[PDB]
C-alpha cells in the first residue's frame, strides 16, 4: 500500500496527470471543475435532459511492463431521491472502460472499441480528506494487458457525478 511496492502510471492530482483528458461531447457533458492545493475534477449532471451518453477519456497511458494495472477512483454523486423533479431515467452509477493500444495518439476510439471494466457505484467504502470532503473510493483491476499502453474512459448515461481523482498503478514483483 506504499510507493515502495507500487508504480504509479497515472495520478490525476499530479502536475502532468491533469492534461490530456478528452470529453465527448466537448461541452455540455463532463466538464472540468477545480475544487482546491487545487484539484482538477470532472463533473456531469444532466439529470433533466433525456438520453444522455457522455464520455470522458484519458490520454495514452503506458503500462510499462505491467500485466495488470489497478484503477482507484475517488468520486461523489447525488442520489435521485436528493433531486426532486428529475427525469424518471435518473441514474446513480457510471461505467468504466479501457482500450489497449500500441499507439499514443489515437484520435478515433469509438464506444465499441472500449471494453467495459465494471459499473461504478457509490457504495460502502469511502475516504475523507477548513473543511473535509467525504468521497467514495472504488478500486478495479484489469489484465492481462498486452499492448504497449491503454486508454481509460468514463461514461455517463444520466447521473450527477463528480470525479475528484483517478489513480492508476501496478504492483511490483
Amino acid at each position: 500500500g506504499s510507493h515502495m511496492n507500487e508504480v504509479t502510471l497515472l495520478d490525476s492530482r499530479s502536475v502532468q496527470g491533469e492534461l490530456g483528458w478528452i470529453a465527448s461531447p466537448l461541452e455540455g457533458g463532463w466538464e472540468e471543475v477545480s475544487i482546491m492545493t487545487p484539484i482538477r475534477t470532472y463533473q456531469v449532471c444532466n439529470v433533466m435532459e433525456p438520453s444522455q451518453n457522455n464520455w470522458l477519456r484519458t490520454d495514452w497511458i503506458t503500462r510499462e511492463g505491467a500485466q495488470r494495472v489497478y484503477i482507484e477512483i475517488k468520486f461523489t454523486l447525488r442520489d435521485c431521491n436528493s433531486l426532486p423533479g428529475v427525469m424518471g431515467t435518473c441514474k446513480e452509477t457510471f461505467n468504466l472502460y479501457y482500450y489497449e493500444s500500441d499507439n499514443d495518439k489515437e484520435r478515433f476510439i469509438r464506444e465499441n472499441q472500449f471494453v467495459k471494466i465494471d459499473t461504478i457505484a457509490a457504495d460502502e467504502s469511502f475516504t475523507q480528506v477548513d473543511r473535509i470532503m467525504k468521497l467514495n473510493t472504488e478500486i478495479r483491476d484489469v489484465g492481462p494487458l498486452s499492448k504497449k499502453g491503454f486508454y481509460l474512459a468514463f461514461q455517463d448515461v444520466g447521473a450527477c457525478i463528480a470525479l475528484v481523482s483517478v489513480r492508476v498503478f501496478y504492483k511490483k514483483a
Partner: peptide, 11 residues
Amino acid sequence: XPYLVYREWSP
C-alpha cells in the same frame, strides 16, 4: 447544463 455542481452541491 449541470443541474448541480459539487464544490457542497450548488446549482
